[PDB]
Amino acid sequence: SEEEWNTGETYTCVVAHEALPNRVTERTVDKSTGKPTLYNVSLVMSDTAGTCY
Amino acid sequence: DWNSGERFTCTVTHTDLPSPLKQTISRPKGVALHRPDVYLLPPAREQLNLRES
């Protein structure tokens, strides 16, 4: 339905192939990770210079 | 007079026997004059970062 993904459900897909070393792998994506329509980065760089540089 | 480049010394003696104590309570004038270079340095970064004093 258009409710779980719209809610932001983080879906995951697992697959097992013989050729793979671990024999198992997976990926995942949610609403945001699904082509983020917009970022919300708010990084803060505290103490840009001190002791270390 | 006291600051006339003269190391003023008292002449107090004793009653039992004359003992002139010419102790130089005056500062040593002359010898050599030089500007006392003064540098005023601030606290280290670590001290301030510790935020104690």
Swiss-Prot record, chain B:
N-glycosylated; important for IgM secretion and its localization at the plasma membrane. The interaction with FCMR is glycan-independent. It comes from the Eukaryota. Constant region of immunoglobulin heavy chains. Immunoglobulins, also known as antibodies, are membrane-bound or secreted glycoproteins produced by B lymphocytes. In the recognition phase of humoral immunity, the membrane-bound immunoglobulins serve as receptors which, upon binding of a specific antigen, trigger the clonal expansion and differentiation of B lymphocytes into immunoglobulins-secreting plasma cells. Secreted immunoglobulins mediate the effector phase of humoral immunity, which results in the elimination of bound antigens. The basic structural unit of both sIgM and mIgM molecules consists of two identical heavy chains and two identical light chains; disulfide-linked. N-terminal variable regions of the heavy and light chains form the antigen binding sites, whereas the C-terminal constant regions of the heavy chains interact with immune receptors to mediate effector functions. It is linked to Agammaglobulinemia 1, autosomal recessive: A primary immunodeficiency characterized by profoundly low or absent serum antibodies and low or absent circulating B cells due to an early block of B-cell development. Affected individuals develop severe infections in the first years of life. This is Immunoglobulin heavy constant mu. The gene is IGHM. The chain holds residues 294 to 346 of 474 of the full protein.
